[PDB]
Design an enzyme around this catalytic site. Sequence first.
Site, PDB file in Angstrom:
ATOM      1  N   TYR A  29      52.333  51.273  47.218  1.00 55.30           N
ATOM      2  CA  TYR A  29      52.300  49.896  46.726  1.00 55.30           C
ATOM      3  C   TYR A  29      53.666  49.456  46.194  1.00 55.30           C
ATOM      4  O   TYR A  29      53.827  49.065  45.038  1.00 55.30           O
ATOM      5  CB  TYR A  29      51.220  49.744  45.663  1.00 55.30           C
TER       6      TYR A  29
ATOM      7  N   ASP B 204      57.464  42.267  41.100  1.00 55.91           N
ATOM      8  CA  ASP B 204      56.250  42.357  41.912  1.00 55.91           C
ATOM      9  C   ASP B 204      56.295  43.592  42.809  1.00 55.91           C
ATOM     10  O   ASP B 204      55.937  43.543  43.985  1.00 55.91           O
ATOM     11  CB  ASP B 204      56.072  41.059  42.704  1.00 55.91           C
TER      12      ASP B 204
ATOM     13  N   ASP C 277      44.521  23.590  46.734  1.00 54.82           N
ATOM     14  CA  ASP C 277      45.521  24.638  46.570  1.00 54.82           C
ATOM     15  C   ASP C 277      44.873  26.027  46.643  1.00 54.82           C
ATOM     16  O   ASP C 277      43.659  26.175  46.810  1.00 54.82           O
ATOM     17  CB  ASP C 277      46.291  24.431  45.262  1.00 54.82           C
TER      18      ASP C 277
ATOM     19  N   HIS D  32      41.768  47.057  49.775  1.00 57.41           N
ATOM     20  CA  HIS D  32      42.704  48.040  49.233  1.00 57.41           C
ATOM     21  C   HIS D  32      42.093  49.440  49.218  1.00 57.41           C
ATOM     22  O   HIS D  32      42.797  50.436  49.415  1.00 57.41           O
ATOM     23  CB  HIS D  32      43.151  47.665  47.814  1.00 57.41           C
TER      24      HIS D  32
ATOM     25  N   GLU E 147      43.705  30.591  53.750  1.00 57.38           N
ATOM     26  CA  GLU E 147      44.300  30.610  52.424  1.00 57.38           C
ATOM     27  C   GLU E 147      43.561  31.633  51.579  1.00 57.38           C
ATOM     28  O   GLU E 147      42.471  32.086  51.943  1.00 57.38           O
ATOM     29  CB  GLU E 147      44.249  29.225  51.775  1.00 57.38           C
TER      30      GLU E 147
ATOM     31  N   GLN F 106      15.531  37.359  38.042  1.00 56.39           N
ATOM     32  CA  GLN F 106      16.085  36.036  38.294  1.00 56.39           C
ATOM     33  C   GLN F 106      17.424  35.941  37.579  1.00 56.39           C
ATOM     34  O   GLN F 106      17.504  36.210  36.377  1.00 56.39           O
ATOM     35  CB  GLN F 106      15.166  34.927  37.804  1.00 56.39           C
TER      36      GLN F 106
ATOM     37  N   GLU G  29      35.801  36.330  55.105  1.00 57.86           N
ATOM     38  CA  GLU G  29      35.459  34.947  54.813  1.00 57.86           C
ATOM     39  C   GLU G  29      34.977  34.221  56.070  1.00 57.86           C
ATOM     40  O   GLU G  29      33.997  33.466  56.023  1.00 57.86           O
ATOM     41  CB  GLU G  29      36.665  34.240  54.198  1.00 57.86           C
TER      42      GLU G  29
ATOM     43  N   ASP H  91      38.911  29.636  55.894  1.00 56.81           N
ATOM     44  CA  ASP H  91      40.273  29.158  56.042  1.00 56.81           C
ATOM     45  C   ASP H  91      41.208  30.356  56.033  1.00 56.81           C
ATOM     46  O   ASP H  91      40.778  31.510  55.912  1.00 56.81           O
ATOM     47  CB  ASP H  91      40.604  28.178  54.923  1.00 56.81           C
TER      48      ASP H  91
ATOM     49  N   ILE I  97      42.420  21.296  40.293  1.00 55.48           N
ATOM     50  CA  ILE I  97      43.349  20.914  41.352  1.00 55.48           C
ATOM     51  C   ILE I  97      42.698  21.242  42.687  1.00 55.48           C
ATOM     52  O   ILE I  97      42.435  22.413  42.978  1.00 55.48           O
ATOM     53  CB  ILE I  97      44.693  21.645  41.216  1.00 55.48           C
TER      54      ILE I  97
ATOM     55  N   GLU J 208      41.204  30.108  47.194  1.00 52.87           N
ATOM     56  CA  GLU J 208      40.977  28.690  46.972  1.00 52.87           C
ATOM     57  C   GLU J 208      39.666  28.397  46.256  1.00 52.87           C
ATOM     58  O   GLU J 208      39.537  27.342  45.620  1.00 52.87           O
ATOM     59  CB  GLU J 208      41.017  27.938  48.315  1.00 52.87           C
TER      60      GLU J 208
ATOM     61  N   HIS K 150      53.462  40.867  46.968  1.00 54.73           N
ATOM     62  CA  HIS K 150      52.683  39.650  47.175  1.00 54.73           C
ATOM     63  C   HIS K 150      53.526  38.496  47.697  1.00 54.73           C
ATOM     64  O   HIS K 150      53.002  37.388  47.894  1.00 54.73           O
ATOM     65  CB  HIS K 150      52.031  39.197  45.864  1.00 54.73           C
TER      66      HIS K 150
ATOM     67  N   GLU L 227      49.383  44.657  51.051  1.00 54.90           N
ATOM     68  CA  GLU L 227      48.880  43.351  50.624  1.00 54.90           C
ATOM     69  C   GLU L 227      48.427  42.504  51.803  1.00 54.90           C
ATOM     70  O   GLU L 227      47.367  41.875  51.752  1.00 54.90           O
ATOM     71  CB  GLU L 227      49.967  42.616  49.830  1.00 54.90           C
TER      72      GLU L 227
ATOM     73  N   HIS M 246      39.447  41.138  49.818  1.00 55.86           N
ATOM     74  CA  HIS M 246      40.834  41.562  49.657  1.00 55.86           C
ATOM     75  C   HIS M 246      40.912  42.863  48.868  1.00 55.86           C
ATOM     76  O   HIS M 246      41.545  43.830  49.297  1.00 55.86           O
ATOM     77  CB  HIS M 246      41.621  40.438  48.956  1.00 55.86           C
ATOM     78  N   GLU M 247      40.291  42.891  47.699  1.00 56.38           N
ATOM     79  CA  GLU M 247      40.476  44.067  46.857  1.00 56.38           C
ATOM     80  C   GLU M 247      39.684  45.261  47.382  1.00 56.38           C
ATOM     81  O   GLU M 247      40.176  46.393  47.297  1.00 56.38           O
ATOM     82  CB  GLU M 247      40.132  43.755  45.397  1.00 56.38           C
TER      83      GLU M 247
HETATM   84  O1  LIG Z   1      46.897  39.547  45.322  1.00 57.53           O
HETATM   85  C1  LIG Z   1      45.907  40.016  44.780  1.00 57.53           C
HETATM   86  N1  LIG Z   1      45.704  41.330  44.613  1.00 57.53           N
HETATM   87  O2  LIG Z   1      46.689  42.233  44.997  1.00 57.53           O
HETATM   88  C2  LIG Z   1      44.783  39.143  44.258  1.00 57.53           C
HETATM   89  C3  LIG Z   1      43.595  39.956  43.748  1.00 57.53           C
HETATM   90  C4  LIG Z   1      42.837  38.960  42.861  1.00 57.53           C
HETATM   91  C5  LIG Z   1      43.625  37.670  42.998  1.00 57.53           C
HETATM   92  C6  LIG Z   1      43.331  37.269  44.462  1.00 57.53           C
HETATM   93  C7  LIG Z   1      44.229  38.190  45.303  1.00 57.53           C
HETATM   94  C8  LIG Z   1      45.064  38.196  43.083  1.00 57.53           C
HETATM   95 CA   LIG Z   2      42.159  24.622  42.903  1.00 55.29          CA
HETATM   96 CA   LIG Z   3      40.182  31.743  51.804  1.00 53.06          CA
HETATM   97 CA   LIG Z   4      16.942  36.975  34.339  1.00 46.70          CA
HETATM   98 CA   LIG Z   5      37.438  29.076  52.058  1.00 42.17          CA
HETATM   99 ZN   LIG Z   6      46.121  42.984  46.746  1.00 35.71          ZN
END
Ligand SMILES: O=C(NO)[C@]12CC[C@H](CC1)C2
Ligand SMILES: [Ca+2]
Ligand SMILES: [Ca+2]
Ligand SMILES: [Ca+2]
Ligand SMILES: [Ca+2]
Ligand SMILES: [Zn+2]
EC number: 3.4.24.27
Length: 316
Positions: free
Chosen positions: A157, A226, A200, A146, A187, A61, A177, A185, A197, A190, A231, A166, A142-143
């Site tokens: 990169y 960067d 965003d 990669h 984005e 658990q 997602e 979405d 906030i 989020e 990014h 990226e 996302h990661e």
């Molecule tokens: O941009 C990024 N990686 O190149 C990230 C990875 C973890 C945060 C969410 C997306 C930053």
């Molecule tokens: Ca937020």
């Molecule tokens: Ca998203």
């Molecule tokens: Ca446990």
């Molecule tokens: Ca979402």
């Molecule tokens: Zn990335």
Amino acid sequence: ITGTSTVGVGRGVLGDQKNINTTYSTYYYLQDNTRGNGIFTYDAKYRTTLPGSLWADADNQFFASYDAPAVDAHYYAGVTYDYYKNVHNRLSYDGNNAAIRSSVHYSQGYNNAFWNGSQMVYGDGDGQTFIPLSGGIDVVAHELTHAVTDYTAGLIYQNESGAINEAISDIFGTLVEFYANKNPDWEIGEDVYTPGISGDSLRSMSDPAKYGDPDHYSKRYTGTQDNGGVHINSGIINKAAYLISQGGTHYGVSVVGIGRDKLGKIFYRALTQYLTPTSNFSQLRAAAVQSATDLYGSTSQEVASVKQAFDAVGVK
Ligand SMILES: O=C(NO)[C@]12CC[C@H](CC1)C2
Ligand SMILES: [Ca+2]
Ligand SMILES: [Ca+2]
Ligand SMILES: [Ca+2]
Ligand SMILES: [Ca+2]
Ligand SMILES: [Zn+2]
């Protein structure tokens, strides 16, 4: 470890209950034997020495606050595995069912998450900029994307290749997602960014300029920050991908959308058949045009929309 496959229950970073595949041998381990050669989640114990220890629990658990980042890293690695297998017939990140390893509680107050060449690493955030970053399914996917890119196109990169790298991670992080279908979405991050906030995120694919990222090639960043803006200039490709899927008129260029599933097929084929380590944006357009042609035909709407979308963001 050697043991018998079991099913635990726990709560993730956002307080949602989910079942997780575990392995029993004296303790219950975050080791999912149902996917490939396994998904393994580790405790880095606030240090930077990787991977740390395979996550062990006395009762199967996982409802403690300390457990939550591990639950989500483990579960969302499984969702990402399922997406690539069921949608693209790809078996883990190397296509041969490589074990997927993740470490959580990396360092102290660490506002990032990353694939380190061999495994996933998640900070807990400082509680203000981020909460534990494995709480974001788009972050996890996302990661892990990669890793897929590293085993396929191998985009370097930096500069335009790195911005494509990226964008590929943002595209498939978003498509995972949507696959999981919890508050989807266009984005990025989020669910774990700025708990204080609402509304965003780190980046927007549908309106990159919402967070100051370019949405046209003429607006690209040309400096050295960067890694040459990987990014930042990703917004140009993210916008093109958004337009291919959802359509729109952007700087006066109209794009008829063809939907997320065809976006995914076109970019997965581009990534795995046509892109190279040094591909630039123009070469990405060519790869996407060729991919859509292979799949849907030279005179298809799909090919026309790919062209319109890259036109709209100024990439010839
Ligand atoms: O941009 C990024 N990686 O190149 C990230 C990875 C973890 C945060 C969410 C997306 C930053
Ligand atoms: Ca937020
Ligand atoms: Ca998203
Ligand atoms: Ca446990
Ligand atoms: Ca979402
Ligand atoms: Zn990335």
